[PDB]
Amino acid sequence: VSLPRMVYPQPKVLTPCRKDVLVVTPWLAPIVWEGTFNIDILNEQFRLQNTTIGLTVFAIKKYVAFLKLFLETAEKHFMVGHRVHYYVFTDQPAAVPRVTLGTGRQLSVLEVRRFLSEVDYLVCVDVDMEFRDHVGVEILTPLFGTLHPGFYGSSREAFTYERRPQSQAYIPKDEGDFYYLGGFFGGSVQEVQRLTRACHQAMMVDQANGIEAVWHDESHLNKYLLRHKPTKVLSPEYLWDQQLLGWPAVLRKLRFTAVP
Template identity: 65%
Template sequence: MQPEKNEKSSTRKCFCVLIYLVLLSLASFCWINLKRSRWHPQLTICDPQTKAQTDVSVSRLEHLPIASLESMLYEKPNALKPPRTDVLMLTPWLAPIIWEGGFNIDILNAQFHQRNVHVGLTVFAIKKYTVFLQIFIETAEKFFMVGHKVNYYVFTDRIKDIPNITVAEGRQLVVLEVPSYQRWQDVSMRRMEMIRDHSQQRFINEVDYLVCVDVDMKFSDYVGVEILTDVFGTLHPGFYGSSREHFTFERRKQSTACIPPDEGDFYYAGGYFGGTVEEVFKLTNFCHNAMMTDKANHIEAIWHDESYLNKYFLYHKPTKILSPEYLWDNNFGGRDFLKKRRFVAVPKNHNAIRNRRALNDYSRLRAKLKFLG
């Protein structure tokens, strides 16, 4: 009888040990998987036939393209000698200000070619402004983003007036029909709405960056990938070097574009801004919504879309700033700091292109500009 009891007791002990080992194995397995899941993202795959789900550990880093290294010869940068000392080249928030002599375009081209970037260039050829499109596109073909893929997005209310222009391989001219407005101020302000809407509906699927400029201009020197960044603005040539009190910001507190007298970094031009499609969408969405708020309160900012652009850049700092090289009017003459004139205004008869009120507005603007020579 005693041996039988000992045998049963031994069997129970073996069974308990076995159960303990199984539980220990399960606990170890769960702990290892939990630890691994902290470091490896899980992709859940659903089988449409069985509705079964399988967790597959996949890292998105595994799908990144292999980096290729190419040799390049160029002059070594001198850490003790800045490229220029006559102009400001860096903002307090560490955004570079783009000047001739401050970058190596060959290095930048190589970097952006590796990324295979596609750039969109938007212009508004509304009413009689279609007359500027020919020289705009022809000079852009010669100087703008040479060697890179470009889409020209032309907003117009006069499709029949758009000239037949042949563009280089890798580039295309896209004509977008939009409504017109009686006042040029309304045309100017509605640009923000149209760029915003097309960014969401089309541009986001076609290009990586957007450059938004005026059409009554021409390229006279190279403008390349050195300008590309998350979001950029351009220094207004008429206010370069001026103090805050001379900036024609919107000062009325009732306006959403209001900038207090003791605030403001630079005065940015409304006719030249850009960045990634996502950032341009955010910028134009803010400006349009602010305009609509003011319109509901019967307020129109002093310089229309440009006033709202300056308000946006005050509190959403641009990640690059273009110098007056990128937006110039030859009526200002030459300046010692200006080594390039990359994008210049086309001489025009404002009375013929706009209406009489527009001419008067333009004359008042010229009278306000205090340029430091």
């Protein structure tokens, strides 16, 4: 459907949006930084499609204690205005806190195909986190990864990829675009299921061969995103640790952060 009339600042062809950072990958995927997007335009596009976003978290054992702050802050910052379905995977269904949700937002508790019928996009994150600023439809795309906040300025030789050729997650020293985080990725339901299927299969082959990748699921994620380039990449605004890394000039917003 057509966008409505909208009044906003004209984009300037001869003024870059950011001169301090890379805003597009060599495969022409945007790298999402503050200042690259007009959220009013994007909200319109995604609302006109009545987009539903699934947000998945695993909260096992002691980690169920992090759900309250996670969900409360998500209510304030994650996809506000859009349909959201939270999926909490937990071994303790009765310990899930009763958090008040905005309209159009729901939570399912899954004790430890349906995703295809219930949501358009899946976003997969860690529970021991909090939202501190806007995380919205600017991230949505067929497949996205997030730049690890400890490695975004590193050479590829310094990336902590799996370096043993015996592992399915093996990446040699001369290969690699970025170091993506295991704790924040997503995409269309189809692409996320493809990713998780590929990673599960690679992990089985490694297990059969007596090897475990150096950073586990993150190592396999990195191999997958090397071979299947993400259609957007999120900047470290989208997963930061202020205690460990401070607040550099390059970060105009800290959107989603570690909870000590």
